[PDB]
Scaffold this motif. Structure first.
Motif, PDB file in Angstrom:
ATOM      1  N   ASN B   2      56.215 -20.940 -90.422  1.00 47.47           N
ATOM      2  CA  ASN B   2      55.231 -19.958 -89.993  1.00 47.47           C
ATOM      3  C   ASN B   2      53.837 -20.317 -90.514  1.00 47.47           C
ATOM      4  O   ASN B   2      53.686 -20.672 -91.679  1.00 47.47           O
ATOM      5  CB  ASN B   2      55.619 -18.581 -90.513  1.00 47.47           C
ATOM      6  CG  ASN B   2      55.639 -18.532 -92.027  1.00 47.47           C
ATOM      7  OD1 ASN B   2      55.586 -19.573 -92.695  1.00 47.47           O
ATOM      8  ND2 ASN B   2      55.735 -17.336 -92.588  1.00 47.47           N
ATOM      9  N   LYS B  16      49.113 -27.307 -87.221  1.00 46.60           N
ATOM     10  CA  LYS B  16      50.212 -27.834 -88.023  1.00 46.60           C
ATOM     11  C   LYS B  16      50.414 -29.331 -87.774  1.00 46.60           C
ATOM     12  O   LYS B  16      50.330 -29.792 -86.646  1.00 46.60           O
ATOM     13  CB  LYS B  16      51.463 -26.999 -87.736  1.00 46.60           C
ATOM     14  CG  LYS B  16      52.793 -27.511 -88.238  1.00 46.60           C
ATOM     15  CD  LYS B  16      53.872 -26.443 -88.078  1.00 46.60           C
ATOM     16  CE  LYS B  16      55.199 -26.756 -88.712  1.00 46.60           C
ATOM     17  NZ  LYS B  16      56.346 -26.132 -88.041  1.00 46.60           N
ATOM     18  N   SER B  44      54.942 -30.165 -93.947  1.00 47.90           N
ATOM     19  CA  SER B  44      54.073 -29.585 -92.937  1.00 47.90           C
ATOM     20  C   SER B  44      52.724 -29.193 -93.536  1.00 47.90           C
ATOM     21  O   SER B  44      52.676 -28.386 -94.459  1.00 47.90           O
ATOM     22  CB  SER B  44      54.734 -28.413 -92.308  1.00 47.90           C
ATOM     23  OG  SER B  44      55.911 -28.826 -91.617  1.00 47.90           O
ATOM     24  N   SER B  70      51.512 -29.827 -83.729  1.00 48.08           N
ATOM     25  CA  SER B  70      51.467 -28.724 -82.792  1.00 48.08           C
ATOM     26  C   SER B  70      50.290 -27.807 -83.092  1.00 48.08           C
ATOM     27  O   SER B  70      49.994 -27.535 -84.252  1.00 48.08           O
ATOM     28  CB  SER B  70      52.757 -27.965 -82.793  1.00 48.08           C
ATOM     29  OG  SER B  70      53.031 -27.415 -84.074  1.00 48.08           O
ATOM     30  N   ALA B  72      48.403 -24.428 -83.775  1.00 49.11           N
ATOM     31  CA  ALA B  72      48.908 -23.376 -84.628  1.00 49.11           C
ATOM     32  C   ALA B  72      49.080 -22.103 -83.820  1.00 49.11           C
ATOM     33  O   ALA B  72      49.857 -21.237 -84.219  1.00 49.11           O
ATOM     34  CB  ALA B  72      47.975 -23.168 -85.780  1.00 49.11           C
ATOM     35  N   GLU B  75      52.447 -22.332 -82.222  1.00 51.16           N
ATOM     36  CA  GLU B  75      53.258 -22.123 -83.409  1.00 51.16           C
ATOM     37  C   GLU B  75      52.941 -20.712 -83.888  1.00 51.16           C
ATOM     38  O   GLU B  75      52.006 -20.099 -83.385  1.00 51.16           O
ATOM     39  CB  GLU B  75      52.928 -23.280 -84.359  1.00 51.16           C
ATOM     40  CG  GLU B  75      53.490 -23.164 -85.774  1.00 51.16           C
ATOM     41  CD  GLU B  75      55.005 -23.268 -85.891  1.00 51.16           C
ATOM     42  OE1 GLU B  75      55.540 -24.353 -85.571  1.00 51.16           O
ATOM     43  OE2 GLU B  75      55.660 -22.281 -86.304  1.00 51.16           O
TER      44      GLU B  75
END
Ligand SMILES: *[C@H](C)[C@H]1/C(=C/c2[nH]c(/C=C3N=C(/C=C4\NC(=O)C(CC)=C4C)C(C)=C\3CCC(=O)O)c(CCC(=O)O)c2C)NC(=O)[C@@H]1C
Lengths: 46, 273
Positions: B2, B16, B44, B70, B72, B75
């Motif tokens: 997260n 990320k 990460s 990716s 965020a 995500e």
């Protein structure tokens, strides 16, 4: 096999050199590393 | 993992980054050899667009290599709503079905059989459709036809790996996601000797398919509700296989066919082979 050892002259020792500079343990450093699982305390100390 | 904030203090799009960590990147403060912590084998980092370049160069200069980047915003988005699939619906083709009821089943089938994926009018199969509504073909038999159809092969089986195709198949034919490595194995072996057709046949033939929506019931998502002889991890796998509504199994997208379920996850649930 004399095993003459002797006090010697200077007699500086381990400690005296650093006390002269006055580091008083600032030059030696113990690193602190965080862990993914850590006590809140451990975070606090960090 | 997260990610807590989508944008940084000065406006930037946080991203990320996941890297395989190396001893040089992070090392304990211990005597002896430098070792990166085990838990952070995959590491990460979240970084503004500006630093990304410099952050990644450094990771790659060291023994690190970038597993994936990716945005965020994508995500730290909810797990997809299970609203529609929590209770699927169910479609039953009665004998002597009215023209409309036949149409409903066809539309439902194409949905579940081919995933969200859109079927053009040209793509759609008249002959198969014709047979249902005169009688003579079970909904189950229609299902068979569709899997055998090139449309399905071009999408699912021909583009992606047979490891991909098996779960892709499980989901379409059964709500369920695959449980255990063994199922994936078995299907591949069946494909080698028997060929495509027999593998397709096995799913429809299998009793699980018969026990729920056996005949004249279009398949619906059994996954996302508890099922007999289903490992708990399978449920979690379903979330990986099924992303949202309006999310489809697409050969079209960049590197279109890949694995929703990572192989290690399967191994977790069961191993033995
Ligand atoms: C020895 C019985 C077997 C073996 C071990 C082996 N391990 C590595 C490399 C690493 N192993 C670890 C594990 C740890 N690092 C930690 O910080 C901790 C606990 C806190 C552990 C237990 C890690 C992180 C590495 C990789 C980086 C590092 O060395 O610090 C290797 C070498 C791999 C390499 O290419 O460096 C080996 C050989 N492997 C064997 O041959 C035995 C079966």
């Amino acid at each position: 096999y004399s095993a003459f050892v002797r006090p010697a002259d200077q007699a500086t020792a381990d400690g005296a050199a650093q006390t002269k500079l006055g580091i008083t343990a600032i030059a030696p450093d113990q690193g602190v590393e965080l862990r993914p699982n850590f006590t809140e305390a451990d975070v606090i100390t960090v | 993992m997260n990610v807590l904030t989508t944008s940084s203090q000065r406006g930037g799009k946080l991203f990320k980054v996941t890297m395989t960590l190396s001893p040089a990147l992070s090392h304990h403060p211990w005597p002896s050899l430098d070792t990166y912590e085990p838990s952070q084998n995959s590491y990460s980092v979240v970084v503004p667009l500006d630093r990304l370049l410099a952050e990644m160069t450094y990771i790659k200069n060291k023994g690190g290599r970038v597993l994936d980047i990716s945005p965020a915003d994508l995500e730290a988005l909810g797990p997809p709503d299970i609203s529609s699939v929590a209770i699927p619906l169910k479609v039953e083709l009665w004998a002597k079905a009215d023209v409309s009821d036949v149409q409903a089943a066809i539309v439902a089938a194409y949905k579940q059989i081919f995933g969200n994926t859109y079927v053009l009018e040209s793509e759609r199969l008249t002959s198969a459709e014709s047979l249902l509504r005169n009688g003579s073909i079970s909904v189950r038999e229609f299902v068979r036809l569709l899997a055998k159809s090139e449309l399905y092969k071009e999408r699912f089986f021909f583009c992606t790996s047979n490891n991909r195709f098996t779960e892709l198949n499980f989901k379409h034919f059964l709500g369920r996601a695959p449980y255990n490595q063994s199922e994936i194995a078995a299907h591949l072996d069946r494909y080698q000797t028997f060929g495509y057709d027999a593998e397709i046949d096995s799913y429809i033939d299998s009793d699980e398919y018969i026990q729920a929506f056996g005949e004249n019931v279009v398949p619906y998502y059994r996954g996302f509700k508890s099922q007999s002889g289903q490992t708990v991890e399978s449920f979690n796998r379903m979330f990986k296989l099924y992303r949202g509504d309006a999310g489809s199994d697409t050969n079209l997208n960049l590197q279109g066919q890949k694995r929703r379920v990572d192989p290690k996850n399967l191994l977790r649930s069961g191993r033995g082979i």
